[PDB]
């Protein structure tokens, strides 16, 4: 978010077509940010605060941001206001650059380890039952 926010400051004066539609660019950023902060997160759920700080959006809109993120197809999921959570059933497959892969490598290493311990831990117990 921030780095982009820096980038726009220069060229936004330069290209007049960018001078118009700054609103778009802002929305679009907030979205992409949201999408990622969900995509990396191990268990997918969010408070509204989390999205607020992540997107630097005051939290009223946060539910407009989420709802609009769905109506474009980007997310599926639901909103629970009472507790201010966002469940995010699933997030759209999207072509991934280099760095974003690394985190996937990580989470997949984790979910390899959990199995390491579980499988290797279940012979001991019930060693008297095997065939």
């Amino acid at each position: 978010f921030d780095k982009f926010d820096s980038l726009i400051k220069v060229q936004i004066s330069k290209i007049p077509i960018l001078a118009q539609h700054e609103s778009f660019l802002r929305q679009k950023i907030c979205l992409m940010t949201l999408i990622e902060t969900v995509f990396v997160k191990n268990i997918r759920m969010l408070s509204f605060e989390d999205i607020s700080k992540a997107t630097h959006l005051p939290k009223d809109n946060v539910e407009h941001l989420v709802m609009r993120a769905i109506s474009l197809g980007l997310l599926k999921g639901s909103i629970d206001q009472v507790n201010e959570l966002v469940t995010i059933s699933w997030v759209q497959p999207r072509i991934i650059s280099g760095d974003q892969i690394t985190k996937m490598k990580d989470r997949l290493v984790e979910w390899n380890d959990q199995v390491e311990k579980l499988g290797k831990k279940m012979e001991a117990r019930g060693q008297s039952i095997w065939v």
Binding site: M122, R125, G126, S128, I129
Partner: protein, 69 residues
């Protein structure tokens, strides 16, 4: 021999007593004999007022190995 009883009673009776009431129960003529006794009873005292206080997977395999012996 009686007082512990009441004590051993009241421990489970209800968690909450004003000190004057403990004096009432245990037949003290004294206020300080109370917290003497309660310390001897290890009772944490608040200003006259006393308070008296395996994964499922494992379970499954356990049932199994118990069955196939």
């Amino acid at each position: 021999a009686i007082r512990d009883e009441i004590a051993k009673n009241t421990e489970l009776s209800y968690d909450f007593l004003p000190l004057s009431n403990i004096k009432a129960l245990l037949f003290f003529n004294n206020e300080k004999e109370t917290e003497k006794f309660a310390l001897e009873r290890n009772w944490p005292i608040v200003n006259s007022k006393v308070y008296f206080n395996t994964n499922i997977i494992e379970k499954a395999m356990d049932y199994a190995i118990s069955i196939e012996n």
